[PDB]
Design a protein around this ligand. Sequence first.
Ligand SMILES: *CC(=O)N1CCC[C@@H](N(CC2CCCCC2)[C@H]2CC[C@H](O)CC2)C1
Ligand SMILES: *CC(=O)N1CCC[C@@H](N(CC2CCCCC2)[C@H]2CC[C@H](O)CC2)C1
Lengths: 304, 304
Amino acid sequence: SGFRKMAFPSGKVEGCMVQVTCGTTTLNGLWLDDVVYCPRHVICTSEDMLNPNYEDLLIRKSNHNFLVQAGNVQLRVIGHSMQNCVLKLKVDTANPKTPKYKFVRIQPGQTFSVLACYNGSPSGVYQCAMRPNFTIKGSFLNGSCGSVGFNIDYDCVSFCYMHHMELPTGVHAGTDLEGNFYGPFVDRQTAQAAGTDTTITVNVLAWLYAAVINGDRWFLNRFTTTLNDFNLVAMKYNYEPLTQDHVDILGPLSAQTGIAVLDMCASLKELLQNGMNGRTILGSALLEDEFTPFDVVRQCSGVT
Amino acid sequence: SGFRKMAFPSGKVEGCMVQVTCGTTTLNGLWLDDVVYCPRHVICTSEDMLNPNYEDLLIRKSNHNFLVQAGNVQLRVIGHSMQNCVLKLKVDTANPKTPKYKFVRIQPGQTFSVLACYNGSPSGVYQCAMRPNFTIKGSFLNGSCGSVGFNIDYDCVSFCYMHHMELPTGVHAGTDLEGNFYGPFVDRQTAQAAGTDTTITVNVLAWLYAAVINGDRWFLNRFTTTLNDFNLVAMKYNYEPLTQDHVDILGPLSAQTGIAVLDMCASLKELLQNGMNGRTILGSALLEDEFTPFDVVRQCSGVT
Ligand SMILES: *CC(=O)N1CCC[C@@H](N(CC2CCCCC2)[C@H]2CC[C@H](O)CC2)C1
Ligand SMILES: *CC(=O)N1CCC[C@@H](N(CC2CCCCC2)[C@H]2CC[C@H](O)CC2)C1
């Protein structure tokens, strides 16, 4: 028993981290097979960071200008290209530590682990969620750009995120591994609006099921509700509307605990309307939304 | 910016996990050089788990009874011995993935990462603290025994914990890598009292400094206090007494922020006496104590 914000073991990803330098800018790259992936803003300078013309900036760069270092060994760059907001540097050596991998574009509300890196060196790993507004609340300092987010299914790493920037509000924005930003963000030093964020309702319900499984049951009540009544409350409290797809994904947890999804919705409704009254659930004094129903089943069953 | 409960990258530890089976019991082992370390309770059975005579039980076991598997390859056991509550199985092959390592006995209040494992396979990584009562609030299911806790200093892994058991209260107990339990716990299926736990005051103050660095400053007030006055409040709220050693370790954070340690103690005093009034600090609605002053500096400076 016990419930923790657990990240995937980062080993398969640590073996892929490299340092990329262009001019005087250094950030992280991801070395998979004979390609190194990194944020294209590695080619920009302070003079043009307000509105870089990446096409023109990349034209002034040659293969030998991209310095790629894997630990202490230098990689030879034999090709370079820009795909959306990522640079793909073809190298002459395939990474011997390349795990089985996929590039995936995650949905908002889904979770992933982040391996924060500096100078191509891993510093730490944490679990987070892609917010409904397509930002992530990470921990990233200068030099963390190019750090990636991922999920692991047995031996396969699905890379889903590459860090590009911190908004003036302290939240983080990035791309999938094809260089497409999550959300409306652009890779330029400008004030950018992150939309109204909402709480991931299906994840809070999944976490409430995790709480019941682990013995924290005080919030269970003698009430039920309907999807429509619940959604009136969800809208009032800036929670995502619950759909029948969300109810269906909660099926296994409803089955294991014997608590119907709409009965758990009534418990959640009461917690939203009345607060926690100074109590905690799984060591938290607020409603946690960064655990998916998949994460709860995985953690509560022991998926390695 | 941003503040997360970050674990160390687990790669160096993943390379050391093996599966150990004895009779019909399977748990995890840690393969370092030519030795595999695991909980000695791997040799016990349901009939004798209430009070095992480990000396007598180990005498009925031979080297060939200990099945050690590293992924898909079987290791040859050429020696076996019990040191306190751990079994040391000498193998004929040194682990080629053995990182630079040390065995350390951590102090209560110190933090470490845990690589939860099942059948010798890593499932996830999380950061936790050794409670003042020598328990850890982990996430461990059946088969997680032998999973280890560690810290990483550049290329050196300091192993500090090996998981042995879950108390009837759902908290976790284990040993250092010499097999000595943290706390008064014994490796037997009996009701065991975990003492009164207290909040790690120096860590809460370190986290308050992390909050200030990241912009969460609402809790700062126009007051100061003394070590003696503060400790009267700490005792009332089951917080560890703050010593001058704790004030000294907070020195760097006091210097960076310009907030004297006793002024931060007055902010903490007010938060204890008045609560959070429905507000949050670093995304938490309670006072976090599982970040040491070292963790706050590391995360806020980018130590890889
Ligand atoms: C995140 C990271 O590691 N890096 C590499 C170093 C430069 C850095 N920033 C520049 C770019 C410009 C284009 C849009 C994204 C950010 C700067 C911005 C100014 C700040 O004062 C320091 C980091 C990105
Ligand atoms: C934690 C773990 O992986 N393992 C291996 C499988 C047996 C397990 N437990 C037995 C020992 C007995 C000695 C004291 C520590 C626990 C059992 C206890 C009973 C429970 O119902 C299942 C796990 C330890």
